[PDB]
Symmetry: C2
Subunit: 639 residues, 2 copies
C-alpha cells in the first residue's frame, strides 16, 4: 500500500491466513518451530507492552519538559530544571528568581513585558518547528486516527521523526500558554507507538490489518497515560476510535492503557502522587436527591456545543478561504500576542488551564483558603469575564497549525459551569440551610455536596456535547477518578449533555474535523434515510460515458485503484511489469471478486462496505455484469 490509499480488508485477512498456514505447516519439522510460533504469539502482546512503556515514559517526558519550559515564562529555579516550580521551590527563595529579580532585582511593567515577550518567543519557536519539520502534528490528531482506522493509508503519518516532532511541539505549544491541550493527542502518539514498536516484528510490519488491530489497541494508551485513566481509555478505543473492533481486541486493547497506567504508577521516585495537575481522586458516596443538577448542568454543556462546533468550525472555513491562511505563523504570533496582552491582567486567566482544572476539582479543606474557598462577588464577576474570554479564545484556538487539543480547555469550561451551581447552592444554603432540599437528607456537621465532583461532571457534559461520547466518557471519568459506585452520575450527565447537544445537529468536533478536512470517512453513527433504488449508487453517471472495464491512459482519466477483467490492481501491474522487464498475468489476476444484485437496496450494500470494508464490488443482474461500485462512489452519493 502506497501513501493516501485504502486497505482491502479481505486481502489483509487472506495474507494473514496464508502466513498462519505456512507457519503451522513449518511447525511439523521440529519443536523449535512450535516454540517460535509461541514466541510470535507472545510478541503480539509484547507489542502492546512496549507501546505502554513508551506511552508512560513519553507522557512523563512531555510533562517534565512542559513543566520545565512553561514556568520559564515566570522564572527558573537554578538548582533544578526538569522538575516543576513547586518541586524546586519547596524541597528545603534564593534558588528561585523570577525574571524581574533577574533583570532589575526588585516592577509590574517589567513582569508584564516579560511574560509577553517570552510567551511570544515560545509560540514562535513552536510554530517554526512545526512548519519546518512536521505539518501532521497540527490538531489533536484524533479524527485523523479515526480515518486511519476507517481503512486509510498514510505511510509517513507514524514515522519516528513525526512522532518526535509532535512530542516536542506539543510540549512547546502547551508551554506557550495558548488554550491548547495534550490529553488526546497521546492517542495519535499511542497509535504511532503501536506502529514503531511493531516495526521490529514482521507480523505487524507486513500485514496492515494487524497494524490496524494494534492501533485500535493503543488508541486507549493516550487516554490512559494522559490522565491515568485506563478503562476509560480502552472503552474510548472500543466506542469512539476503532471503526472495526472485534471483542477479542478489547481485552488486548485494555492492557495497553493499563500498562501505561502501570508505567505511570511505577514512575514516582520523588514522592509525588499526582498523575496530572488536576488529579483529584474521589471516594465520596452519593445519594438520590443529587440528580437534579446532574441533568440541569447538561443544558450549558449542550449549549456550549452549539456555541463551539459552530463558531470554531465556521472560523476554520474562513481560516481556509481567506488570505489569512497564507501567513499562519504570523497569525499564531498575533494570536499568541493577544493571548499574552489580555490574559495577564486577570490572575484566573493568566494561570494555566490544567491547573485551573486542579483548582476547580480540589474540594475545600480546613487548611486551604484559596479563591474558591474564600467565603467575593467581584471575584465571581472576574471569573465570568475570564470564562467568556476563554470561550472566545479556545473557539479561536483548536483549528491552528500547531499541535492543539481541546480536552483541557473544554473540561475547564465545563468545570466552571459545574462549580457555578455548587457556589450558588452553598451561598443559598448559608442563609437558608433549612430550605427543603437541605432539610430532608443532609446531616448536621458533615459535608453533604461536593462542588468539585459537579465540576468534573460538567466537564464531562461539555465534552459530550462537543464530541458526543456516550459509552466511553462514562468510563473516562470512571478512571480519571476511581469509581464503580459513581458510574450512575456519569451515565445521566452524559445522557443529558448528549440530548441537549443533539438539538442542533449530528456532528461533533471530531466528526466536524473529519468533515471540514473531508477525510474519506464513512460515518458509523448515522443511517441512510433517502429511499431509492441501487440504480443511482453505481457509476458512471448519466453525464459520463460507459464504464471502461492502454492501462496508463485509463488510470490518467480516472483514479480508480482497481479495474475488472478476475481483477487486478495498479500496484500489482506495476510490480509485475517491472519484474518481467528486469527478467525479459494470470498468476496475479484475482478470480474471486465480490458481487451484489443490482436490485439490492442501499441499506444492505452500504453496511456491507461499512463493517466488512471491502474496497470495491461488481454489480450484476441475472448474472450479467453491469458496473463497479467503490467506496468513493458511495461517499460521493452521500455528499
Amino acid at each position: 500500500y502506497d501513501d493516501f490509499h485504502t486497505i482491502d480488508w479481505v486481502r489483509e485477512k487472506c495474507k494473514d491466513r496464508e502466513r498462519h498456514r505456512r507457519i503451522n505447516s513449518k511447525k511439523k519439522e521440529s519443536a523449535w518451530e512450535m516454540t517460535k510460533s509461541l514466541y510470535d504469539a507472545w510478541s503480539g502482546w509484547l507489542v502492546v507492552t512496549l507501546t505502554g512503556l513508551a506511552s508512560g515514559a513519553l507522557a512523563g517526558l512531555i510533562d517534565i519538559a512542559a513543566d520545565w519550559m512553561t514556568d520559564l515564562k515566570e522564572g527558573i529555579c537554578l538548582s533544578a530544571l526538569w522538575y516543576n516550580h513547586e518541586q524546586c521551590c519547596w524541597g528545603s527563595c534564593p534558588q528561585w528568581k523570577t525574571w524581574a529579580e533577574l533583570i532589575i532585582g526588585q516592577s509590574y511593567i517589567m513582569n508584564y513585558i516579560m511574560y509577553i515577550f517570552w510567551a511570544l518567543s515560545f509560540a514562535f519557536l513552536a510554530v517554526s518547528l512545526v512548519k519546518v519539520f512536521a505539518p501532521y502534528a497540527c490538531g489533536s490528531g484524533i479524527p485523523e486516527i479515526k480515518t486511519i482506522l476507517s481503512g486509510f493509508i498514510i505511510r509517513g503519518y507514524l514515522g519516528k521523526w513525526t512522532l518526535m516532532i509532535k512530542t516536542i511541539t506539543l510540549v512547546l505549544a502547551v508551554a506557550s500558554g495558548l488554550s491548547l491541550g495534550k490529553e488526546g493527542p497521546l492517542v495519535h502518539v499511542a497509535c504511532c507507538c503501536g506502529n514503531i514498536f511493531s516495526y521490529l516484528f514482521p507480523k505487524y510490519s507486513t500485514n496492515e490489518a494487524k497494524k490496524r488491530e494494534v492501533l485500535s489497541a493503543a488508541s486507549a494508551a493516550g487516554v490512559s497515560v494522559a490522565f491515568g485513566a485506563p478503562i476509560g481509555g480502552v472503552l474510548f478505543s472500543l466506542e469512539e476510535v476503532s471503526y472495526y473492533f472485534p471483542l477479542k481486541t478489547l481485552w488486548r486493547s485494555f492492557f495497553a492503557a493499563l500498562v501505561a497506567a502501570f508505567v505511570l504508577r511505577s514512575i514516582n521516585p520523588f514522592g509525588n502522587s499526582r498523575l496530572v495537575l488536576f488529579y483529584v481522586e474521589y471516594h465520596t458516596p452519593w445519594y438520590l436527591f443529587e440528580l437534579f443538577p446532574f441533568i440541569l448542568l447538561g443544558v450549558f454543556g449542550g449549549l456550549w456545543g452549539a456555541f463551539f462546533i459552530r463558531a470554531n468550525i465556521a472560523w476554520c472555513r474562513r481560516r481556509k478561504s481567506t488570505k489569512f491562511g497564507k501567513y499562519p505563523v504570523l497569525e499564531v504570533i498575533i494570536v499568541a500576542a493577544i493571548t499574552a496582552v489580555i490574559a495577564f491582567p486577570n490572575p484566573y486567566t493568566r494561570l494555566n488551564t490544567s491547573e485551573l482544572i486542579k483548582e476547580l476539582f480540589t474540594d475545600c479543606g480546613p487548611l486551604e483558603s484559596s479563591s474558591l474557598c474564600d467565603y467575593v462577588y467581584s471575584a465571581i464577576w472576574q471569573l465570568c469575564l475570564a470564562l467568556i474570554f476563554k470561550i472566545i479564545m479556545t473557539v479561536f484556538t483548536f483549528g491552528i497549525k500547531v499541535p492543539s487539543g481541546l480536552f483541557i480547555p473544554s473540561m475547564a469550561i465545563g468545570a466552571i459551569a459545574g462549580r457555578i451551581v455548587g457556589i450558588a447552592v452553598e451561598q443559598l444554603a448559608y442563609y437558608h440551610h433549612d430550605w427543603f432540599i437541605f432539610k430532608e437528607w443532609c446531616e448536621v456537621g458533615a459535608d453533604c455536596i461536593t462542588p468539585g465532583l459537579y465540576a468534573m461532571v460538567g466537564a464531562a457534559a461539555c465534552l459530550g456535547g462537543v464530541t458526543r461520547m456516550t459509552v466511553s466518557l462514562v468510563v473516562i471519568v470512571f478512571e480519571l477518578t476511581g469509581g464503580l459506585e459513581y458510574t450512575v452520575p456519569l451515565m445521566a450527565a452524559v445522557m443529558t449533555s448528549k440530548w441537549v447537544g443533539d438539538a442542533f445537529g449530528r456532528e461533533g468536533i471530531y466528526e466536524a474535523h473529519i468533515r471540514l478536512n473531508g477525510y474519506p470517512f464513512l460515518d458509523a453513527k448515522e443511517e441512510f434515510t433517502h429511499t431509492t433504488l441501487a440504480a443511482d449508487v453505481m457509476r458512471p453517471r448519466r453525464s459520463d460515458p460507459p464504464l471502461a472495464v492502454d492501462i496508463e491512459n485509463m488510470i490518467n482519466e480516472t483514479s480508480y485503484n482497481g479495474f475488472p477483467v478476475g481483477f487486478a490492481l495498479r500496484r500489482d501491474l506495476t510490480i509485475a511489469i517491472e519484474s518481467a522487464r528486469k527478467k525479459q498475468l494470470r498468476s496475479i489476476l484475482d478470480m474471486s471478486p465480490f458481487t451484489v444484485t443490482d436490485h439490492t437496496p442501499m441499506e444492505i450494500v452500504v453496511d456491507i462496505f461499512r463493517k466488512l470494508g471491502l474496497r470495491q464490488c461488481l454489480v450484476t443482474h441475472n448474472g450479467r455484469l453491469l458496473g463497479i461500485i467503490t467506496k468513493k462512489d458511495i461517499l460521493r452519493h452521500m455528499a
Copy 2:
C-alpha cells in the same frame, strides 16, 4: 417464525426499517406522533428497567424460598418462615426446633433418618414438578440461550408458565441439597424476562431482532442479580453469550444488570447486607510477589477442566444411550438417596455449597474461631475426603433432568484448591516466617496474605477451565467483589487457567452442552482449518440427485425452509394460499437474494454467514446459478 426455526437477520432488519420509515412518515401529522415516537424509543430502556426489576425481585424470591425450604431438612422456625435460620434464630431456642425435638423431644439416628427422608422427598417433588410441568428448565440453560442468540427459534422457551416453573424448580432443586446452582440460570430467567416484559409492546413482540437485542442485554441481568456483579454480567453478555453484539448494545445491556444490582441494593429492610451467602467484599491492596500462586493454582483449574469436561460429558452420553434414561426420576431419587447417604457423616460436605464458598472466602478475624481459623491435620484430611466426594458427585450432577447449575460447585472446588495454598503458606510461615519469600516484603504485625482472595481466584480459574471465560470472568470477579485495583490478578488467573485447560481440547461445558445436545451452533471461537474449494461446502452431494429448485411433496422429501425461483418461504406460501382460498404470487416473491461467486473460498463465505447469519444463499459462476448454500449444509460439512 415457528418452533425449531432459524432467523433471517436481513428480513428482521428490513422489517425494522420499514417500521421506522412508517412511524416517521406518520410523524409529520401532529406533535402527538412525535411524542409517541419518543415513547417508543424509550420503550427499550423501559423494557430493560422492568427486566432488572423482575431480575432483582425474583432473585430475592428465589433466595427467600430457598432459605425457607432448604433449612426444612433440619427444622423450621414457627414464628417466621420466609427468612433464614439465622434471621429467626438471632433476632431476639423455643422459636426453633430441630425436628428431633419435634418427634422425640431430645438422637443421632433420628436426625440421620429424617434428613434422608426429607432429602428424598424434596428430590421427588422437584423431579415430579419439572416432568409434569416443564422439561426445558433442565440444566443451567446458558448454552440454549447461546443457541437462541445464534439464530434459533423456540416459541415456548420464554413463556410465563415455563418461567415460573423454572423459578420454582430451581428453588426446589437447590433446596434438595444436590450439587447444583442457580447463578447462571438467572441468565435464562433474565432472557425470558426480556421477552415477557417485552410482550406488552408491539415494537419488541413484532420484530425478532429486537428480541435478540434485549436477550443479549438481559443475559447480564442474571450474572448481576445472582452474585451482585453488574459489569461482570454485561461483559459476560458481550463476550460469552451474545453471538452478535453491536457496541451500542453494551451500554444499554449494562443498565439491565445494573438495575438488578439497583433492585438488589434497595431491597434490604431487615438490615442484612449480604448479596448472597458468600458475598465477601474485598478492599485489601496487593503487591508484586503474590503473583507466583496466581499462576500455579491455574494448573488444577486447567486440570479440573480435563477432569470435568470429560467425566461429565462422558456420563451424559451414557445417560442418553442406556436404559437408565428411561427412568430419570428414579435415577434422581437414587442420586438424591446417595446424595444424603454419604454427605451426612462429614459436617463439611453435609453443609450447603454456597455457604461453603462463604466459609472459604471469609477471611479470619480476631473473633471468629471456625474450622478454617482453627489453628487440625485430621480436619484437613476430612476436607480432602469431602473434596473428592464433591468431585465424584458434581461430575455426576450437571446433566440431570432438574434445573442444574455448576457455578457454585465449580467455584467451591476452585476455592478449596486456592485455600489449600493459603493454608500451606500460612503453616510454613508460622515456623519459618523469616523465609526469603516472607523476609523481603511483609511487615511485622499486619496481615500480608489473604487466603480468601486466593480461593476466589482459584474458583475463577476452575470456571475458566470449565467454561473458558477470559474477557468477562475478570469482570465477574471484578464486580462480585469491588475491584479496579484487583483486575490484574484476575487476568493472570484466567490466562493460566485457560492455558492449562486448553491442553486437552477446545470445548467447554457450555460448548460441550451445545455439542452433546448438538444445537445448531456455529462455533465463534474457532476458525476453519481444512483447505478445500467451494464445491465441497455446496449441496446436493455426489450421492444425491440434482437440486430441486407439488410443493408439499417437495417439502416432504427435503426439509429446507425456502427455495429459489426471486425466492419464497414456506410460511409465506402457507399464509398466501390460505388467504387466497378464504378469498375465492409475485407480491410475496422476494426478488433480492444474496449471491456469492462459486470460486469464493470457505473462509469468506463461512464468516459472512457467521456474523450476518443469512439463512441461505445462491451460488453463481459467471452469472450462472449452480446451487443453494444454507446454514444446515455448512454445519453438516463442519460435522
